[PDB]
Design an enzyme around this catalytic site. Structure first.
Site, PDB file in Angstrom:
ATOM      1  N   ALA A 107     -16.347 -14.636 -13.609  1.00 49.88           N
ATOM      2  CA  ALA A 107     -16.624 -13.683 -14.631  1.00 49.88           C
ATOM      3  C   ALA A 107     -17.694 -13.780 -15.492  1.00 49.88           C
ATOM      4  O   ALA A 107     -17.936 -15.104 -15.525  1.00 49.88           O
ATOM      5  CB  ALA A 107     -15.377 -13.474 -15.340  1.00 49.88           C
ATOM      6  N   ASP A 108     -18.583 -12.811 -15.787  1.00 49.51           N
ATOM      7  CA  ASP A 108     -19.729 -13.176 -16.644  1.00 49.51           C
ATOM      8  C   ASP A 108     -19.332 -13.103 -18.322  1.00 49.51           C
ATOM      9  O   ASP A 108     -18.144 -12.512 -18.286  1.00 49.51           O
ATOM     10  CB  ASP A 108     -20.857 -12.194 -16.156  1.00 49.51           C
ATOM     11  CG  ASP A 108     -20.404 -10.688 -16.532  1.00 49.51           C
ATOM     12  OD1 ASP A 108     -19.529 -10.381 -16.950  1.00 49.51           O
ATOM     13  OD2 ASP A 108     -21.044  -9.862 -16.015  1.00 49.51           O
ATOM     14  N   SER A 109     -20.122 -13.508 -19.027  1.00 52.10           N
ATOM     15  CA  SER A 109     -19.771 -13.269 -20.389  1.00 52.10           C
ATOM     16  C   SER A 109     -19.307 -11.952 -20.981  1.00 52.10           C
ATOM     17  O   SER A 109     -18.775 -11.848 -21.739  1.00 52.10           O
ATOM     18  CB  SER A 109     -21.012 -13.746 -21.279  1.00 52.10           C
ATOM     19  OG  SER A 109     -22.059 -13.113 -20.589  1.00 52.10           O
TER      20      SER A 109
END
Ligand SMILES: C[As](C)(=O)[O-]
Ligand SMILES: C[As](C)(=O)[O-]
Ligand SMILES: [Ca+2]
Ligand SMILES: [Ca+2]
Ligand SMILES: [Fe+3]
Ligand SMILES: [Fe+3]
Ligand SMILES: [Fe+3]
Ligand SMILES: [Fe+3]
Lengths: 82, 348, 353, 82
Positions: free
Chosen positions: A36-38
């Site tokens: 997951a990205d920010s």
């Protein structure tokens, strides 16, 4: 930490990050580790608030290391309004 | 260092584009002449700063300035901050040409290179210089702003430079610029449309005119990128996605006056609040492009080409929700002094 | 392709463009000297906080006195003869085409700003330098505007034509050629603004004399730092540097604003120069003294152990100053009566060439 | 074409073009042939003006290709002055 809390948290992270039930998600498992990205992270929180009907200030949104760390804070916010 | 500007906070990547692809652009030299250079306004037909400002050569000059100043009295400071903000961005023009000239296939090899790209770059730079000069002289005449501070802020910015993270790839660069040029189109559209409501239809024209220019440039950049999708549908998408992940960092983002350490953020916050350039717009700018280039309709991309395409298409509605959320949870905005307006305060 | 001649065409460069004449191996030299530049070159930059700004010299628009301040600026400007203003607008236009110079510095092989914010000592210099030069433009620009002695629309059009046009100093991406060029070029503007300052002083505008005298102060600082690089290149590559130095002089330092165009005058630069020549702002005699200064500064006469055509090149450079000065003196004798001419910068009012 | 002007030109051509007295010179040797840049062309005439007390006008200067074509224009301007 309790089973039903972890339940919907596991489910919400799955449904968000597009993963089948065959994909493993423990309490100790991390967010970045699940890919997951920010941005996905803030979205995950935003879903939780709509699913649980309680919301988090972002000054507690950075400590979010694991499902455990995240399902832990939900049980302290529901022990406030309920 | 007692007086340090903000530096870029990421390892600099260069020449990410595979050297083979430089050819593409050599092959498209004669294409650019035909489809890109036509978006340049012949110098003779161009407006000039002088057209919009008081005519110093006529008797009427004294009144002309005097009115400029009287109408400027009515414009609230928070607006001036956002105006000075543009003026400063625009005045750092050397950087943008210098950046366009970092791009592998299209860089001006000599400073007077007769290639269609070097012709474009230089001619484009020439049209942009007018934005700077015109806002500059106007912001001077108004006497509403500390011109010394603004000029110091410009020196700090041109010293600082910028890294749009285009990594010498004309894919990345022209996509960036495509985006960037439209932002200033929406940006100046609003400031124009706002000055009009504040009762200064001369300043509304000034902004609306820059907007007219910015559209023309946006047309020519989207048109290059359109070609790259038609020629390299994979590379272009992958790049397009790459840019959006990095997030288009606005060229004036290392802004420094020697007092405010996050000067850019504070400036932005004021434009955000004035509705001049919001997070909602950044979304509509991205979405526009996805429609413009027909990213949704692309066929035959690679394994992670598709992952990239899907990412870009779903990004606009994704931001807009995150946006709406932030507004709900958003705390009361503080008031803050700005050295551009003699430390008078506005709301962030 | 398949072309003709357009109605409003600027002057283009009239020579085949040469690129990357410097042997790619030598790019290393400048990587090795990165830490040297920090120590000897960047110190010639004036910390931004201590820099003057255009506002310092112009009327203060924030104070009540503004109306008088402008009014005086204009009254003193009445007394300045047009032929001077032509040469002034000439600098203003040169200066305002700054994007080009940065762009040209960034063509140079070993020192080019690779990213636009490259933390290398050369890219730091280039950007910081550009920032200091932007102020010359802005300040002359605003002043020329406030005076009301010049057709600002035409000047602005002339700038657009010049930034479009660009320039080719014929530096061929060689930092040898470029830094020698700039060394020269920066001194010319030192002598240039020295004179214009010292002349405005005589015309009774000591505020405008300061303005030009200040730019000169800056230009000397740059000149110092450029001559200092090139000095290092003589110390490290006495052969290559001389050869390049000679190469530049043979080509002749073509002034950066030499493709000037207003849409009316086809040889606008020459006519502008002719007026600066006649006013003694920048003469052919100076071009000699600029060259000769450098030959002394870099000790070209005292160089040891050059190649077979290294010596030919060195000898050429040393004997060039007295050679020009004679050819110069001659031209003045045979020189015909100068004609009068209109200049669109001053509403077609006429001056002597 | 008198052999007192062809004599005095030889010395000035040699002394200017840095050619030793060993390179043989006739009345038909060109300036491009003898290896010289464009600046020298005037500089050669420059000396003759100071070494003959006569000034050749800028006009009739460029027509010169060899020594005879040059030493000839000296003969004429010494005839309507001396
Ligand atoms: C020169 As611009 C920052 O308005 O694209
Ligand atoms: C910017 As300059 C050509 O006056 O050194
Ligand atoms: Ca400018
Ligand atoms: Ca400028
Ligand atoms: Fe612009
Ligand atoms: Fe723009
Ligand atoms: Fe300068
Ligand atoms: Fe300079």
């Amino acid at each position: 930490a309790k089973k039903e809390t972890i339940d919907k948290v596991s489910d919400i992270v799955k449904e968000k990050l597009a993963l089948g039930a065959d994909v493993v998600v423990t309490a100790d498992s991390e967010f970045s580790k699940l890919g997951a990205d920010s941005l996905d992270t803030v979205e995950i929180v935003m879903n939780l608030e709509e699913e649980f009907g309680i919301n988090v200030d972002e000054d507690k949104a950075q400590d979010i290391s694991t499902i455990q760390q995240a399902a832990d804070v939900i049980e302290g916010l529901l022990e406030k309004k309920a | 260092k007692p007086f340090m500007p903000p530096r870029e906070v990421h390892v600099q990547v260069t020449h990410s584009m595979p050297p083979q692809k430089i050819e593409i652009f050599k092959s498209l030299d004669n294409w650019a002449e035909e489809n890109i250079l036509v978006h340049l306004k012949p110098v003779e037909k161009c407006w000039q700063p002088q057209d919009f400002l008081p005519d110093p050569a006529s008797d009427g000059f004294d009144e002309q300035v005097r009115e400029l100043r009287e109408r400027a009295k009515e414009i609230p400071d928070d607006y001036f901050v956002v105006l000075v903000g543009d003026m400063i961005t625009e005045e750092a023009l050397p950087t943008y040409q210098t950046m366009l000239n970092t791009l592998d296939g299209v860089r001006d090899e000599t400073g007077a290179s007769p290639t269609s790209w070097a012709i474009w770059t230089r001619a484009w730079t020439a049209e942009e210089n007018r934005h700077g000069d015109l806002l500059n002289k106007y912001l001077y005449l108004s006497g509403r702003v500390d011109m010394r501070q603004i000029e110091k802020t410009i020196q700090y910015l041109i010293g600082s430079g910028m890294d749009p993270r285009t990594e010498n790839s004309p894919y990345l660069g022209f996509i960036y610029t495509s985006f960037q040029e439209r932002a200033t189109f929406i940006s100046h559209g609003n400031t124009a449309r706002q000055a009009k409501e504040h009762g200064d239809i001369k300043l509304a024209q000034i902004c609306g005119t820059i907007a007219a220019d910015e559209k023309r440039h946006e047309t020519a950049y989207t048109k290059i990128v359109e070609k790259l999708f038609e020629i390299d549908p994979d590379g272009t998408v992958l790049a397009f996605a790459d840019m959006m992940r990095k997030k288009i960092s606005m060229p004036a983002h290392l802004m420094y006056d020697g007092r405010d350490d996050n000067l850019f953020d504070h400036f932005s916050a004021v434009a955000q609040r004035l509705g001049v350039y919001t997070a909602k717009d950044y979304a509509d700018i991205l979405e526009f492009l996805v429609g413009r280039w027909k990213v949704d309709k692309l066929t035959g991309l690679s394994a992670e080409g598709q992952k990239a395409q899907d990412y870009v298409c779903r990004l606009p509605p994704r931001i807009r929700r995150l946006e709406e959320r932030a507004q709900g949870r958003a705390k009361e905005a503080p008031t803050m002094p700005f050295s551009w307006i003699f430390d008078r305060q506005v709301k962030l």
